[PDB]
From a paper:
Bats possess distinctive characteristic in their MHC-I molecule, with prevalent 3- or 5-amino acid (3AA or 5AA) insertions at the N-terminal end of the peptide binding groove (PBG), which may generate a unique antiviral immune response. To explore the influence of the 5AA insertion on the structure and function of bat MHC-I, we focused on Mylu-B*67:01.
To examine how the insertion influences the peptide presentation by Mylu-B*67:01, a mutant version of Mylu-B*67:01, named Mylu-B*67:01ΔMQQPW, was created by removing the MQQPW sequence. To explore this hypothesis, the COVID-19 P1 peptide was mutated at the P1-F position, generating P1-T and P1-E mutants that were more compatible with the P1 residue preference of Mylu-B*67:01ΔMQQPW. The crystal structures of wild-type and mutant P1 peptides in complex with Mylu-B*67:01 and Mylu-B*67:01ΔMQQPW were solved, except pMylu-B*67:01ΔMQQPW-P1-E which may be attributed to by its low thermal stability. The binding patterns of peptides P1-F and P1-T with both Mylu-B*67:01 and the variant Mylu-B*67:01ΔMQQPW remain largely unchanged, with the primary structural variations localized around the region where the MQQPW sequence has been inserted.
Author numbering:
A (entry chain A): 6 to 280
B (entry chain C): 1 to 9
C (entry chain B): 1 to 98
């Protein structure tokens, strides 16, 4: 399948309360495997999945050096961005970066990413050619001319076609039993009387990995997406995910309704109903 | 393994 | 400017009175990242763990805040969120059906 290695960098300036705080996390697919926090005493890259504890100390030493670099560079970034937007010193601002690589089934690089946001809005992004940038605005255009003049994209190109694909494959191997084993949803329907006119049929998908899922209701073969309550997929807290879809049905009608579950962990799509 | 931008914005 | 957080409060497992379980508050879609998220037992603040700050494709942040709990007929559980997008803190009651 299409596995991904993604790093998420967040820096927040706190005027008056010292220098900016840097936070980084890394994920393989929907699984967090590292963190870093520049406010930690003697801050280090810390494993957060079982299967990354099985690198040498030097692996964490390396990630630590890079996260300290990213922390420092962002301290300047927040300063130069305040200048670009001609903002005062008093407001807190945010810089975000998301970078990584997608691996398609061939096992070679499908797609590289490296994108930035200032106060949550698009700022600059490496285009999929890995050579040109898309700037969101006149401030980011300054950054685009400077990074194009310096040939910065080659360094992300290097990292991407080299290290990123390499370490993704290492992680997918070391984590085979977790990352490359899909857990199917356990599906059930509950029944929650509301009134003389309405009974809520709730279809539950529990204990599934990865996060991606389709949960639908049909009335006699007829999709109910426009008139069903659907919650955002949510973490169980044990590394699995949850979702539900619900419809208001007239009492007695319950057996007209079928709930459909599709997930890469199911040989067959599940069809189920009340009782 | 992560990566840090050569230069600031 | 700021984006208002969405809030779900739920148990890891279907709730059974007297069976210890894990109470979750998932708060997502917010910006800026500064946020106060507490789990309350009868309006009183519980000891909690918070996930590492991360964010989605659209740059909006998400956190999981969680604790141990034992559901009862006696006790109300709620998640309290305060963020710059809100006039005052929002509280979301835990209901076993949600």
């Amino acid at each position: 399948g299409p596995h991904s290695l993604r790093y998420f960098y967040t820096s927040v300036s706190r005027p008056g309360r010292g220098e900016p705080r840097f936070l980084a996390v890394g994920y393989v697919d929907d699984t967090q495997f590292v963190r870093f926090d520049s406010d930690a005493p003697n801050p280090k890259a810390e494993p957060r999945a079982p299967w990354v504890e099985q690198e040498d100390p030097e692996y964490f030493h390396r990630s630590t050096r890079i996260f300290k670099g990213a922390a420092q560079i962002d301290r300047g970034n927040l300063q130069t961005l305040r200048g670009y937007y001609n903002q005062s010193e008093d407001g807190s601002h945010t810089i975000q970066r998301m970078f990584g690589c997608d691996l398609g089934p061939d096992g070679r690089l499908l797609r590289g990413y490296n994108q930035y946001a200032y106060d949550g809005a698009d700022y600059i992004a490496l285009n999929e050619d890995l050579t040109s940038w898309t700037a969101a605005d006149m401030a980011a255009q300054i950054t685009k001319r400077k990074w194009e003049a310096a040939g910065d994209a080659e360094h992300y190109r290097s990292y991407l076609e080299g290290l990123c694909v390499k370490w993704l494959q290492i992680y997918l191997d070391k984590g085979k039993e977790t990352l490359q084993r899909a857990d199917p949803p356990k599906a059930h329907v509950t029944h929650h009387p509301v009134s003389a006119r309405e009974v809520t049929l709730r279809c539950w998908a529990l204990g599934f990995y990865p996060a991606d899922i389709s949960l639908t209701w049909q009335r006699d073969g007829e999709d109910q997406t426009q008139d069903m309550e659907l919650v955002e997929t949510r973490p169980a807290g044990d590394g699995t995910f949850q979702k539900w879809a619900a419809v208001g049905v007239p009492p007695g009608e319950e057996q007209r309704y079928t709930c459909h579950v599709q997930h890469e962990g199911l040989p067959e799509p599940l069809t189920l109903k009340w009782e | 393994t992560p990566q840090s931008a050569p230069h600031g914005v | 400017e700021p984006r208002t957080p969405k809030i779900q409060v739920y148990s890891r497992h279907p709730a059974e009175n007297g069976k210890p379980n894990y109470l979750n508050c998932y708060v997502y879609g917010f910006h800026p990242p500064q946020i106060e998220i507490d789990l309350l037992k009868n309006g009183q603040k519980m000891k909690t763990e918070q996930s590492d700050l991360s964010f989605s494709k659209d740059w909006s942040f998400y956190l999981l805040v969680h604790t141990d709990f034992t559901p009862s007929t006696v006790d109300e559980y709620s998640c309290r969120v305060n963020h710059s997008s809100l006039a005052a803190p929002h509280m979301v009651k835990w209901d076993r059906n949600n």
